Write a protein that binds this DNA or RNA. Sequence first.
DNA 1: CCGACAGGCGCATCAG
DNA 2: CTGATGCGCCT
DNA 3: GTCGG
Length: 327
Amino acid sequence: ETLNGGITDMLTELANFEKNVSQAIHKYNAYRKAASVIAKYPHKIKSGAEAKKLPGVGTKIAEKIDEFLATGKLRKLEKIRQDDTSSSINFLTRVSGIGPSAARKFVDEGIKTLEDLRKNEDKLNHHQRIGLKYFGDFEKRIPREEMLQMQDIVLNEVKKVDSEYIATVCGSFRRGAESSGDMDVLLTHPSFTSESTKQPKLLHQVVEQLQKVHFITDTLSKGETKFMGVCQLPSKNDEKEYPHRRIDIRLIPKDQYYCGVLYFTGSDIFNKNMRAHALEKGFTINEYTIRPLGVTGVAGEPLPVDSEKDIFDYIQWKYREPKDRSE
DNA sequence: CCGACAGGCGCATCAG
DNA sequence: CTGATGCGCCT
DNA sequence: GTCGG
Ligand SMILES: [Cl-]
Ligand SMILES: [Mg+2]
Ligand SMILES: [Mg+2]
Ligand SMILES: [Mg+2]
Ligand SMILES: [Mg+2]
Ligand SMILES: [Mg+2]
Ligand SMILES: [Mg+2]
């Protein structure tokens, strides 16, 4: 299916173990870094020493790669796969709203199956309850055809609330992916800038309208600038319903759109790589601004930005189109 | 050898 | 009630 | 787990 798929699968599985079971986030990310650089490597890897030349692959992963190439498996992962506790904790984290901490606690309390979760909903917070309700649906991917229908609904309903809003579908969709895990919507309005909020309830307005027309069905979390919830396309007579889908909406100051869209377009690993490179170059990037770093570590004042490319220029990177920011 | 590893929103919890 | 903390999440 | 001072 992919060039070094066995190796990248192995490393991703180790990343998940370190995140979900070990609760070691830097090992998680180190494994993800290695998987990422390897996935982009345009040769079929013949040895661990060859892999070790790539940035992010060290002695330990090279050693694992040699085992995998020689035997087709990793004894370390075979052990983890048979460990009941590890498997159960891993499984529970697949429910949206259950992370490593909550999964371990549930598993300690004897709760380790979908059945167990369902007969213990009173032990779940709101988010987790909705994640359980739509467990199967949330692991389905969204065909780009459906993303396009969803975009049409969101853009048209936003326009009905106020023609001044601009809604931009970001994430994997903006990177040209033929399928997406969920929908990410960046929202701006003239009355919300970094200098003032001249109208309240800007995000609420939009969420309310999408609820009215039955597009948004559930709310996981909702503040002044970020909505996390569930939506569903309308189905026609006699047709099975579409799966429920995860949707995220982020209201960003209009004058900080470019940092906002850079953030929201990702990928996640791309953002981590780009932000880490910015730090190396003496800058810090968030979804709002790019700022210089002084000697002390105090971030300076936001630099002027009027394109995505400007952010790349500051850190001396050649521009990468959204399509080339994917894993 | 070892300090740093991206950055931040919303929620739930804790001390006072 | 604040204010601080950490979880789980987003890209 | 990795790597640049
Ligand atoms: Cl606001
Ligand atoms: Mg989860
Ligand atoms: Mg994602
Ligand atoms: Mg997405
Ligand atoms: Mg999302
Ligand atoms: Mg229905
Ligand atoms: Mg964090």
